[PDB]
Amino acid sequence: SRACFQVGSEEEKRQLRTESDGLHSFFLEIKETTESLRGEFSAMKIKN
């Protein structure tokens, strides 16, 4: 019964998954914006 293996609140596992998925989306947006800006800097360098 005394061996309660409460491996977090199924809530903490859901929250960690949502936060991980949110961080992954944010890293994709940073990557895309950085790749876009790198393109613009390269074009501006050529034009100069």
Partner: protein, 42 residues
């Protein structure tokens, strides 16, 4: 009387086995999901 007691303990043991597998088995499933999410975060 002894046979009724044996049958009762057999049913209680099968119910405890099922409860133990549910308590385990679920933790093992969460551990696999946690490991996969840890690899993705890395």
């Amino acid at each position: 009387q002894l046979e009724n007691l044996i049958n009762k303990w057999s049913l209680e043991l099968e119910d405890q086995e099922k409860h133990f597998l549910q308590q385990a088995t679920q933790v093992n499933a969460w551990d696999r999901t946690l490991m996969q999410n840890g690899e993705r975060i890395t």
